Amino acid sequence: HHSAALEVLFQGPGNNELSPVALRQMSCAAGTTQTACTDDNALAYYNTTKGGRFVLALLSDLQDLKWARFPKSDGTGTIYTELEPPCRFVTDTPKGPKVKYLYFIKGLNNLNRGMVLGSLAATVRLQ
Amino acid sequence: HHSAALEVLFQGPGNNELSPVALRQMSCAAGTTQTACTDDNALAYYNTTKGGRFVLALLSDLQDLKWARFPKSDGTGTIYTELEPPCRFVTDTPKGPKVKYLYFIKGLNNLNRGMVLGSLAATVRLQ
Amino acid sequence: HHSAALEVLFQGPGNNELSPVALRQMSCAAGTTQTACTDDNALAYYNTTKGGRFVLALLSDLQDLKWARFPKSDGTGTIYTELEPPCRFVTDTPKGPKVKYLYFIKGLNNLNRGMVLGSLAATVRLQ
Amino acid sequence: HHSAALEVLFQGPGNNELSPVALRQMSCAAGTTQTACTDDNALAYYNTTKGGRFVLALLSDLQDLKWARFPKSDGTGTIYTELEPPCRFVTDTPKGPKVKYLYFIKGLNNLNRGMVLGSLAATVRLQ
Amino acid sequence: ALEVLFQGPGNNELSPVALRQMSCAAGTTQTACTDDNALAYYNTTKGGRFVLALLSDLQDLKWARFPKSDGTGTIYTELEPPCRFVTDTPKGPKVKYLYFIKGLNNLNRGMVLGSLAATVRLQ
Amino acid sequence: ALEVLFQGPGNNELSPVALRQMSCAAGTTQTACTDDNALAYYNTTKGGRFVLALLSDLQDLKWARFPKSDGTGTIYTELEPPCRFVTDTPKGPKVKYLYFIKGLNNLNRGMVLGSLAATVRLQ
């Protein structure tokens, strides 16, 4: 349904084991408030487990986002997730440098924030 | 002196800006005891600093390592540097799979641990 | 196979959701070193996922433990897990107060340590 | 003045000793805005302190709360206390299931968040 | 200034660093960041300044405006909820509020708190 | 003593507290904790003392022996690996090692570092 994006290493299933997981990415609608989430304007990175999707972070050209909208598990409605203030970084593209803003989901711990930052740094070409 | 290894993103120079940094790698001598830190048996990932090197983690084929003895040029404040218990992960060699052990330096914070894990996951062929 | 012990609340499967999980408990052999893990002398609290068991903490009458021994996923051998230094607490029993030592597994984060402490405090009768 | 609610274990008086403490509960006034903090609409879990009360979390039927206004007797250093985004969890009522929202006080550390989650999980009928 | 100890340049070495202060316009909202009403404590970096914390007489601040010459990624930085502390001054006690920048890690929050406690006459 | 700021007794209030010092026998192993060779900084608690950190001239310590009158759960407490810092004294610079007690949280580690940096003449 959606494409693989950022590889990470989660602990488990046993103690002191690491398992590789591909975070997937999907287009999503974000905005300054829930009802401003209309047109797709961001890319969300998420993990999938049996119970559904867990979103870790969003990338966007826009710097004023605060909320993102996602489909619920099994087309059963809508979910809204609150965002942290963004960090700015610059990518290298065929059109020149492109400024991006990285938003973590509120309530993401620092280990997982770091895994997103490192896998992004290693995967996308940076200016 | 040594090769670039893992790309990461550090905040700075100011608030909410991310800047790319390549961690580098060098061979180093680790051991189950401080006296056993003799011959190179691990790869250290480090950030260059003004007047030294800050090591984040070691990668080894060996289990049960507890200490590393880094060269004086690193500028460590103690002769021996202590390791955390290793994380086991499996790489994809041309010869099949190979089990590796990742040892964080004691005290490394969770954001930086995560950045190493995500950059490693995105940079090396896994399974 | 083993009995339910400590209820906790893990985040997921979606963002900002909590799911109740019963940690289970099993007798295990612990000791000052791996080969000293012979007779059962501790109780281990663990979570089960598809890939196997993840141990969070041990309880014992003994205060000098450093290692614990566990069966591998699917009777495929033995696992050894390193322990943090213990904390002492006192329970209330039909034989009077009983001193216990709680050992977290090395590499357990503070959120999960707290969940063990709180669920223990609420589940066992304390002196 | 108020009833005991959630048992936890705090380290002290000295290193490596755990002492039981009952967090207590009282009704409190929360709101989406500071001005809306009017009538009691949440339950606060707190630790009694010499000269005040330290609130760890609020439980509410309501979503979208952001602030609480605690009584002067709590000894808060600011008029309004800010809440984290809530965690959703489901209790088992005689009437069926009931969705509740758990709001940690902003800044509560991970150990103490975990102790609240584990004590709650062990103390209330869940699902 | 507030003296702190940062690890580096090698592992397990501590180097003393002075956090410096600059005036700062903060506010309940970004649009209200119009006039200097706080002191921002920062670490000088190659190419800029990283702000750790603000001190103010006001307890309702949420956003701060920093100079782009800090090497910032955004004009505004969000603040954590403030903590109250009371200084002992010759003109009597004075109530202040300490704000960490949003997301500052706990080691660095602690260093500001400890440096403040040892540097300023408190009560 | 090292002054720090603890939160409480209510939310978002900061209260100044002096960490006091006592002599401490530490060692590479518990059995080697035979003679005072470190200074332990502690917070006084109802019923005891909670040690946060040790200072020593030695860089190889791993365990510390505390008095049971501290209200401890065990005689010995493990130490984190030390960090080196250099004090500026009239008799010249002197190298010291700072050890946190195992598991001290990062806020409290930071408070010790910041208080130390502001209290002691360093370099």
Ligand SMILES: Cn1c(=O)c2c[nH]cc2n(C)c1=O
């Ligand atoms: C930190 N942490 C947990 O608490 C988990 C509980 N079930 C699965 C978990 N995983 C993969 C994890 O990383």
Ligand SMILES: Cn1c(=O)c2c[nH]cc2n(C)c1=O
């Ligand atoms: C508490 N806990 C668990 O139950 C886990 C199950 N798989 C991975 C886990 N991790 C990392 C964890 O911390």
Ligand SMILES: Cn1c(=O)c2c[nH]cc2n(C)c1=O
């Ligand atoms: C957490 N943290 C710090 O404290 C720093 C101090 N100088 C540079 C720093 N960086 C890049 C950082 O990430």
Ligand SMILES: Cn1c(=O)c2c[nH]cc2n(C)c1=O
């Ligand atoms: C305290 N502090 C600093 O001084 C920094 C300088 N560059 C990046 C920094 N970060 C993230 C930080 O926390």
Ligand SMILES: Cn1c(=O)c2c[nH]cc2n(C)c1=O
């Ligand atoms: C913190 N954390 C994680 O990173 C997880 C990755 N897969 C499942 C996870 N769970 C349940 C968790 O709690």
Ligand SMILES: Cn1c(=O)c2c[nH]cc2n(C)c1=O
């Ligand atoms: C990164 N991550 C995940 O992928 C999760 C999947 N289920 C629960 C999760 N949690 C809490 C998390 O942090």
Ligand SMILES: Cn1c(=O)c2c[nH]cc2n(C)c1=O
């Ligand atoms: C982390 N931490 C502290 O800093 C304390 C200071 N006085 C009492 C404390 N307790 C119980 C605690 O857990």
Ligand SMILES: Cn1c(=O)c2c[nH]cc2n(C)c1=O
């Ligand atoms: C700094 N500090 C203290 O002062 C404590 C007093 N009782 C328990 C304490 N704990 C866990 C702590 O970290």
Ligand SMILES: Cn1c(=O)c2c[nH]cc2n(C)c1=O
């Ligand atoms: C936590 N942390 C870091 O990540 C740093 C990266 N470069 C310099 C750093 N410093 C001083 C620091 O404290």
Ligand SMILES: Cn1c(=O)c2c[nH]cc2n(C)c1=O
């Ligand atoms: C990851 N990392 C670094 O690169 C550092 C460079 N100087 C100091 C550093 N510290 C404390 C750190 O954690």
Ligand SMILES: Cn1c(=O)c2c[nH]cc2n(C)c1=O
């Ligand atoms: C983190 N923490 C705690 O958990 C406390 C419990 N009683 C007193 C406490 N104090 C002062 C503290 O700082």
Ligand SMILES: Cn1c(=O)c2c[nH]cc2n(C)c1=O
């Ligand atoms: C959980 N908890 C408490 O009970 C406290 C009592 N006084 C201060 C406290 N702090 C900072 C805290 O986190």
